[PDB]
Amino acid sequence: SMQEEDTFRELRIFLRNVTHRLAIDKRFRVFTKPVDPDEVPDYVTVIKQPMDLSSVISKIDLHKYLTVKDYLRDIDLICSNALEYNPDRDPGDRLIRHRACALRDTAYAIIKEELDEDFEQLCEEIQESR
Ligand SMILES: Cc1noc(C)c1-c1cc(NS(=O)(=O)c2ccccc2)cc(C(=O)O)c1
């Protein structure tokens, strides 16, 4: 219906706002664009599903997220990809892992404080009826 389309549009608006906030955070700069193959040529061979905050914005705009759970799965992937690609004890790896975990924690904390559980439940019920 028009009402259900209104619900998903509201979800997109909310998700764009959360993502923009995460994108303007200086700690998360390395996650704002896809990993450049000039800079990291073996990335695409090790990491099977690259994800970054610009791609998340693209996916919002393409109507790919119908629930906040589907969005958080992509935030989770940004984090897991960083942990997988940068697993060593050296400080460069530790720094990017800390930032990855902070990105994930920040997104979850924003959602916990600002997303009404009944709104998420409505989105899930519309999605499941599709
Ligand atoms: C992300 C990521 N995952 O594994 C690694 C390793 C990184 C990563 C990638 C880059 N270079 S980049 O071209 O792909 C880029 C620059 C600016 C914004 C977004 C991406 C730099 C660094 C860094 O710490 O400076 C880290």
Ligand SMILES: [Cl-]
């Ligand atoms: Cl830095």
